[PDB]
Amino acid sequence: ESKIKEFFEFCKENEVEFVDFRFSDIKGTWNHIAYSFGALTHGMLKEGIPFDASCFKGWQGIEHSDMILTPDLVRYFIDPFSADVSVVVFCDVYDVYKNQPYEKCPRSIAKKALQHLKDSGLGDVAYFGAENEFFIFDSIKIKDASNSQYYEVDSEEGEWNRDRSFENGVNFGHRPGKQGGYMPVPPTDTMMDIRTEIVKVLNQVGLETFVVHHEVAQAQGEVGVKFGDLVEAADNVQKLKYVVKMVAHLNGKTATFMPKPLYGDNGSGMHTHVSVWKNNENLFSGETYKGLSEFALHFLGGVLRHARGLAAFTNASTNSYKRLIPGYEAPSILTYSANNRSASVRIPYGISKNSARFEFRFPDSSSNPYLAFAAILMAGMDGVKNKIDPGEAMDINLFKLTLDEIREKGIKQMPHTLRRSLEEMLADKQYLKESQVFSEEFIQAYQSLKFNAEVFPWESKPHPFEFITTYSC
Amino acid sequence: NSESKIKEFFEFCKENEVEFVDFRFSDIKGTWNHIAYSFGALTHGMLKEGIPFDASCFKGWQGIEHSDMILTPDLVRYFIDPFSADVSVVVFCDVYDVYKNQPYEKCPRSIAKKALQHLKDSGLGDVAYFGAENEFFIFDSIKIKDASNSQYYEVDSEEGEWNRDRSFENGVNFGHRPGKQGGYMPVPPTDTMMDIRTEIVKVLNQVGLETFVVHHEVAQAQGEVGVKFGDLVEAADNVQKLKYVVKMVAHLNGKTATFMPKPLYGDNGSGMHTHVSVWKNNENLFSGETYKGLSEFALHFLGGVLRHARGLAAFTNASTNSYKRLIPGYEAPSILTYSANNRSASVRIPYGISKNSARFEFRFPDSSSNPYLAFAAILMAGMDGVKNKIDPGEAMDINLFKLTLDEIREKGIKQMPHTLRRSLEEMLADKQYLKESQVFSEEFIQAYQSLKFNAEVFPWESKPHPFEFITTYSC
Amino acid sequence: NSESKIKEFFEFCKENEVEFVDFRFSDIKGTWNHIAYSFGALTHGMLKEGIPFDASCFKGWQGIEHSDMILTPDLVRYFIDPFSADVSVVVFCDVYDVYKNQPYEKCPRSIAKKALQHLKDSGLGDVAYFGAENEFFIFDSIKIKDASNSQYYEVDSEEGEWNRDRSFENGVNFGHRPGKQGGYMPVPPTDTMMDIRTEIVKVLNQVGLETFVVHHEVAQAQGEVGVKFGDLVEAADNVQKLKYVVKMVAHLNGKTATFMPKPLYGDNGSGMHTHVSVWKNNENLFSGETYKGLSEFALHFLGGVLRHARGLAAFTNASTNSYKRLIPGYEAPSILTYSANNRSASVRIPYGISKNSARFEFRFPDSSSNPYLAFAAILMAGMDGVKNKIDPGEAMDINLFKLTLDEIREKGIKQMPHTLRRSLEEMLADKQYLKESQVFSEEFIQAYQSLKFNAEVFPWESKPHPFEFITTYSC
Amino acid sequence: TNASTNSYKRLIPGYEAPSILTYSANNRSASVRIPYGISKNSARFEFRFPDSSSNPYLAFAAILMAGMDGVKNKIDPGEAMDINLFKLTLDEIREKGIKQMPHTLRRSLEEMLADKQYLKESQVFSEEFIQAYQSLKFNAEVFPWESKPHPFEFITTYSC
Numbered sequence A: 001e002s003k004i005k006e007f008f009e010f011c012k013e014n015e016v017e018f019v020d021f022r023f024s025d026i027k028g029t030w031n032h033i034a035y036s037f038g039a040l041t042h043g044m045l046k047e048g049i050p051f052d053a054s055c056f057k058g059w060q061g062i063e064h065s066d067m068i069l070t071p072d073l074v075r076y077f078i079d080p081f082s083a084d085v086s087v088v089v090f091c092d093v094y095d096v097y098k099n100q101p102y103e104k105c106p107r108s109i110a111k112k113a114l115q116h117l118k119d120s121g122l123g124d125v126a127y128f129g130a131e132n133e134f135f136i137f138d139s140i141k142i143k144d145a146s147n148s149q150y151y152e153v154d155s156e157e158g159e160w161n162r163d164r165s166f167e168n169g170v171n172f173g174h175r176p177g178k179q180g181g182y183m184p185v186p187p188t189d190t191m192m193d194i195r196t197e198i199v200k201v202l203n204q205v206g207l208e209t210f211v212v213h214h215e216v217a218q219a220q221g222e223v224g225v226k227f228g229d230l231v232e233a234a235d236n237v238q239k240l241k242y243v244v245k246m247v248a249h250l251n252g253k254t255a256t257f258m259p260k261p262l263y264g265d266n267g268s269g270m271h272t273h274v275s276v277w278k279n280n281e282n283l284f285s286g287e288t289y290k291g292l293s294e295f296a297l298h299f300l301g302g303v304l305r306h307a308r309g310l311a312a313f314t315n316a317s318t319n320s321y322k323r324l325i326p327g328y329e330a331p332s333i334l335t336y337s338a339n340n341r342s343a344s345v346r347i348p349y350g351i352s353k354n355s356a357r358f359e360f361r362f363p364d365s366s367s368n369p370y371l372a373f374a375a376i377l378m379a380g381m382d383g384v385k386n387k388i389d390p391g392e393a394m395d396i397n398l399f400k401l402t403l404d405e406i407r408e409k410g411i412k413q414m415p416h417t418l419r420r421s422l423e424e425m426l427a428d429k430q431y432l433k434e435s436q437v438f439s440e441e442f443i444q445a446y447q448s449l450k451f452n453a454e455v456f457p458w459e460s461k462p463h464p465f466e467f468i469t470t471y472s473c
Numbered sequence B, C: 001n002s003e004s005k006i007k008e009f010f011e012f013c014k015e016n017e018v019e020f021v022d023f024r025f026s027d028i029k030g031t032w033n034h035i036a037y038s039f040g041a042l043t044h045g046m047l048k049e050g051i052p053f054d055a056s057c058f059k060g061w062q063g064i065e066h067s068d069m070i071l072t073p074d075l076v077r078y079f080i081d082p083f084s085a086d087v088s089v090v091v092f093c094d095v096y097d098v099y100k101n102q103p104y105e106k107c108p109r110s111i112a113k114k115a116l117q118h119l120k121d122s123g124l125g126d127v128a129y130f131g132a133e134n135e136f137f138i139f140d141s142i143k144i145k146d147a148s149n150s151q152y153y154e155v156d157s158e159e160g161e162w163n164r165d166r167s168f169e170n171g172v173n174f175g176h177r178p179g180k181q182g183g184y185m186p187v188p189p190t191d192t193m194m195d196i197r198t199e200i201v202k203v204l205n206q207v208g209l210e211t212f213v214v215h216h217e218v219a220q221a222q223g224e225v226g227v228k229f230g231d232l233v234e235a236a237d238n239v240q241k242l243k244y245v246v247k248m249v250a251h252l253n254g255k256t257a258t259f260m261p262k263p264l265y266g267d268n269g270s271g272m273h274t275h276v277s278v279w280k281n282n283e284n285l286f287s288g289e290t291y292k293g294l295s296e297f298a299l300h301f302l303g304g305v306l307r308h309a310r311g312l313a314a315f316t317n318a319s320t321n322s323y324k325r326l327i328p329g330y331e332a333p334s335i336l337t338y339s340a341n342n343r344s345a346s347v348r349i350p351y352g353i354s355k356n357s358a359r360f361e362f363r364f365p366d367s368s369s370n371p372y373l374a375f376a377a378i379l380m381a382g383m384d385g386v387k388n389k390i391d392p393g394e395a396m397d398i399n400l401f402k403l404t405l406d407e408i409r410e411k412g413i414k415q416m417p418h419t420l421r422r423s424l425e426e427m428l429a430d431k432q433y434l435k436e437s438q439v440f441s442e443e444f445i446q447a448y449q450s451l452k453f454n455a456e457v458f459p460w461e462s463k464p465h466p467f468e469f470i471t472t473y474s475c
Numbered sequence D: 001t002n003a004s005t006n007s008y009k010r011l012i013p014g015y016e017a018p019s020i021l022t023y024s025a026n027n028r029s030a031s032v033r034i035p036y037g038i039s040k041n042s043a044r045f046e047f048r049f050p051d052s053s054s055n056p057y058l059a060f061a062a063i064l065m066a067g068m069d070g071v072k073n074k075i076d077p078g079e080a081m082d083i084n085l086f087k088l089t090l091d092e093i094r095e096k097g098i099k100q101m102p103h104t105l106r107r108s109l110e111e112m113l114a115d116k117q118y119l120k121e122s123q124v125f126s127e128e129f130i131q132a133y134q135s136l137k138f139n140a141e142v143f144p145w146e147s148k149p150h151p152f153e154f155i156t157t158y159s160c
């Protein structure tokens, strides 16, 4: 009843016309329901907002439809894009049937995960750093018929348009190749002005930014946002994606975060940077390995342990496993190395006492960031308590190594498809179930979501290529 | 190739004014290739010790540096080609290995010969008969795209649901279409292929196959011809014969044909239902009194197929598109059980069963497989059942498509594999029954798995699927 | 099937040079289905105990785990197919149940056989003669769209009044059209089908039917060919024979036909007028002096049909589109009464009545019905009337279309059901006259019921109608 | 409340719209829902079955007249069916003897002409008016719907 006080005056000052609550279902889809501002009261930011939770896969049945969304009054912001002054408020789903936060609400599973660390005493805060690579495209067509599957992404930069005629029969040239976006100047990079637009809008929504470049792939970009609390970071993951997409829309374009839209060029990742702190210290800083600690070396060993099951949350779509192909800055072998992008985890080279972190490179933004980040922690905490060796560091370009020497040398490796990684995750979920952080009911709801939403379609829908190879059998 | 077998061939050619001789052979994928000779150039020594060719052009076979191999002509089942504009005689060929000096251990017609011979040597029988129903589609068009920014296919047949509102010749649209899953088997004009189908049969007749049924099939532009059973190699030859004709009579009618298992999502798939019986001294050994007119021999055979099925499947369902077909509810099996009159099952025991018709039909193989291999492997697995009296279990006579995933997993029924990699895995974890008597060579199975992982699995896993842009582009 | 008719069938197929034997049979909808055998394959032993087939592909019949069934050939009214390019013979078949070991209780042709027999065994009569007037439309084009955001249909025909102002081949339009309701029966050029109707009649002559009238009918593109009556089963057979011929002669002339009941709003429908008489010992039992040349037997038979009509119409008007047709002002009956020379009644006593020609014309059925089931049902409805001496009321010699809304409900005439759901509920409420002598099994009345509810009513109750957007889109 | 044929294409199971005539709390599968938000002030019913093809003056009038009538005759509501009421099979519905919304406008117009007395209370709905409504809907919605062929029956029936 003070952040309420602070809130209800912050609205009077920006002339807030609508209160836009935003929540995240299990897929990570940020949803919004919005109220007329004069109808909002003190006694509804403690009562909560009713919604229908039966319209969300993995959540409520239709005979127990009504749930409460509960306002949480931090990191709210003024929508840059609405034409009538809206303010955006983060919410949790509260379960009016077990009278507790919703066991299938990710922003709660993340919250539950953030304090599990506190109550474990292993550390106080756990910081998350999310490089979210993206694409900005010109057009996006799809078809899913009985007789035809079909997609086509479009961008003027693309090698498919070197022979093409644009406005006057004209084609201004000046293109990055396949794998050529890193990092030419204009006019080759067409997207200088629009990315300084995003950042300026990201500054205005509360994220602290620091880098903006063009990425390797054809229409690819990246913004460095400053690391945050486990939850706070994923709040900012959702915020980022809203801004980028809506900046793309209003600039007459379409943007995506998906893992791998272009075959044969780089795919957007989610480079997660993690380090755990306590009593003003960075508990990964040490002297045991290249500026790292045994607590660190172990946190790592928990994530390299449950990685195959961890991909179920970290790499949550079939399209992710089109990214995990050797040869595109993306990872595959579950190992670690300093200064090395062909690894699953790179120690950043800029490593002083405060910066000491791991960069897990394997996630992409088809993960739900709350669940994704939640699960990178329980994995790590299981590393500390069970003091589990991370193995030996491999300072090799891992891609080049012949495929028979992976089985031969016995080194673990990312799963090749999603169905696989849902199966490792079900085969050992126990570290996820600590202190009912991830409940089993939710763990179940999750997979009867991802199989029905993702695995079973892929498995049953003819693939264009299957007609090159098999239609002449 | 006898010496009078040779002269009857020359005479046949002479009688028929053969201008060309067209040798044909199958590579591991199952593709049927040819190389043809001026008849005047053909001599009595070429049909005795071989035709030179370049075997490094076929994923699986030779490296560029030991590239030369030899085709050995087998003068059986040759025929005058119905479609060539100059009289030619198609002649079936084996590959000969001119380094190890022996029939090529990777030549799929050789493997089936070794298989059928393995059966004779062991004395379990003299002959394995195979019946193969090869369903096919006939389309009007097939568009494909495979670039970096796009993936795309489209079939077209005027019988198709998607054409109900379409305009054709004069803005005119004729009506009378079968529904999705409604082509079975209405009369014309809903059935727009009665003619091209009787064309097919008559030409199948010319090329040496005996026919009985022809009919329309469930899916929109789908068909089936019933051709009599041959021995293990003869049937696998007649499958290639069938596929050639159906693809050529479709082409000369300005149309295009596919034996791939699942060109349409939401409609019935195209199978190779294989019907099997093993015989010794002129008694069908499958005939008996144990279970619905079948014997303990027959049942054990069945035990081996089911036992080794998930490995077998890497040969009998030889493509990623094969698994799009193995999906509940299109008369395609998913559960590895057997039953009478039950199309929900893997193995169907048919109704009109007699001392002549004692058989099984195995409904899980498709035509994306190599017939020579998918058959040999069905035998190897099957004799492994006889030799070890492997037990099929008891028939499930339910609708298995109704069974829940929990209910299916709980009672712990074995199902088909869900992908081509898994069944390839399962097949490398279980090679022994194939390797009996050098029938399937260890070398060959390695080439086979390397070929298939590189030509089918890694494309699939690494090539974005369109429907992924529905589910994940807006994340 | 005696081995005599088997001798004469084979011998018939040698002199017409037959390459295929096209076996045919009708499902519960009435869709005529075929499956063809290479003639050289055909066997005496096969025409004795039958052809197997996949029975699970037919709504209402078997389920996939008892899918096998036997088609049993019936060597009557076979005929050379005019239309196929390679000589085929079309042969009718029944469905045999190989689980209950009996003619299939859900094969319409058997049920109709059970009806004709039941009349025999009942002693009421030796034979029941059925004459069927099968009106049709010949269109040029038919487009349909069945989507989430759209429902669409367009018929086209050059006769249609929607083309008076349109350009055809070279900016040109020949005029001379019948208007709405004008097709009866102006000479050419207005009548654009003198030659395609004569083609039909002739190809009906070839395939075995006696024809007499051929005319254009009242609606824009309509027509009717009179056929000499047959026995209950034979009349049903020739309804399938006719429908085939008419749909194929449309096809090969660049056109598309339909027996559907009401393809055009505001113009006449397509009816199937059923002419019916029952004889015994060579005398026409309908012949008498009780009313307009008919006997008591006749009237009471009629008493039966009208009593049970509301339920009967689920069997004789079998599609939601049947009920678009059953509305006043287009020569179809909505009012369940009888009258001599009145085309606005349900049943008409045609004028030229002799002792040989005493019959009733039941006018309410349409061709969307299953002819075997529709005729069986009428017979039962009428047998019930003979046995129970049901009185058909008196005659209604008026223009029944001129009867105002709350006036036909005043005088307590009952009228046809307004929707196919309502006809279905009536029939399940009055089954007992169908199951007499087990002619219509109960098991069968339930399959039919779920057949029609699922395949007609629920799609109608659930799919937005375009006209609903006129009335409610601005609500 | 559902004064159009279009109404009855919505009253179909599976689309968050009620077919079965019973009530339940937190249940979008029922005719009447009891909101969890149920204070001393906000105690209401959500009758989920109306739609905006009703004249809403007529609709709220007739809801009241029936809902009033309930009080005078102390009409018992039955037991709460707190089920996903879609999951009921057709036969389980008949055997359980469950009331259910009409499948057609024609039907509900008939069911209403057979049950009028509770609207004619204290002259609120006139016999005269009811009679004029009765014909207006019949001539303007039922008779069109029953006579204008439907696209779907050409898939179904053009090839009969």
Ligand SMILES: Nc1ncnc2c1ncn2[C@@H]1O[C@H](COP(=O)(O)OP(=O)(O)OP(=O)(O)O)[C@@H](O)[C@H]1O
Pocket: A050, A051, A052, A066, D035, D037, D041, D042, D043, D044, D046
């Ligand atoms: N005591 C009351 N009497 C009548 N109407 C009321 C009463 N209290 C609230 N209402 C009205 O009923 C409606 C309820 O809106 P509300 O937002 O509560 O919907 P809901 O059924 O909970 O659906 P959802 O879960 O989709 O938000 C509003 O129009 C509201 O003002």
Ligand SMILES: Nc1ncnc2c1ncn2[C@@H]1O[C@H](COP(=O)(O)OP(=O)(O)O)[C@@H](O)[C@H]1O
Pocket: A127, A128, A129, A130, A131, A211, A224, A225, A226, A227, A228, A273, A274, A275, A282, A348, A349, A350, A354, A355, A356, A357, A359
């Ligand atoms: N101690 C830390 N804990 C967590 N994240 C950090 C820490 N230090 C930096 N980061 C974050 O790492 C992400 C990547 O920063 P960047 O300078 O791009 O590193 P790199 O050299 O790995 O590319 C940013 O979100 C950044 O704020």
Ligand SMILES: Nc1ncnc2c1ncn2[C@@H]1O[C@H](COP(=O)(O)OP(=O)(O)O)[C@@H](O)[C@H]1O
Pocket: B129, B130, B131, B132, B133, B213, B226, B227, B228, B229, B275, B276, B277, B284, B350, B356, B357, B358, B359, C052, C053, C054
């Ligand atoms: N004893 C037998 N062994 C192996 N195959 C057989 C035997 N008898 C028949 N067949 C074959 O079985 C296949 C199909 O049987 P079929 O009669 O077509 O079944 P259905 O028509 O019900 O699908 C054909 O290739 C046929 O020759």
Ligand SMILES: Nc1ncnc2c1ncn2[C@@H]1O[C@H](COP(=O)(O)OP(=O)(O)O)[C@@H](O)[C@H]1O
Pocket: C129, C130, C131, C132, C133, C213, C226, C227, C228, C229, C275, C276, C277, C284, C350, C356, C357, C358, C359, C361
């Ligand atoms: N005794 C009878 N029983 C049954 N049908 C008959 C009998 N006599 C004639 N029919 C048939 O009834 C139909 C009558 O045709 P028609 O006399 O042209 O009638 P309309 O002028 O109403 O078209 C024909 O199929 C004809 O064979």
Ligand SMILES: CP(=O)(O)CC[C@H](N)C(=O)O
Pocket: B135, B217, B218, B268, B269, B270, B271, B272, B273, B325, B330, B331, B332, B343, B363, C054
């Ligand atoms: C009518 P049928 O017995 O031939 C079933 C064939 C099926 N499409 C399949 O996938 O094998």
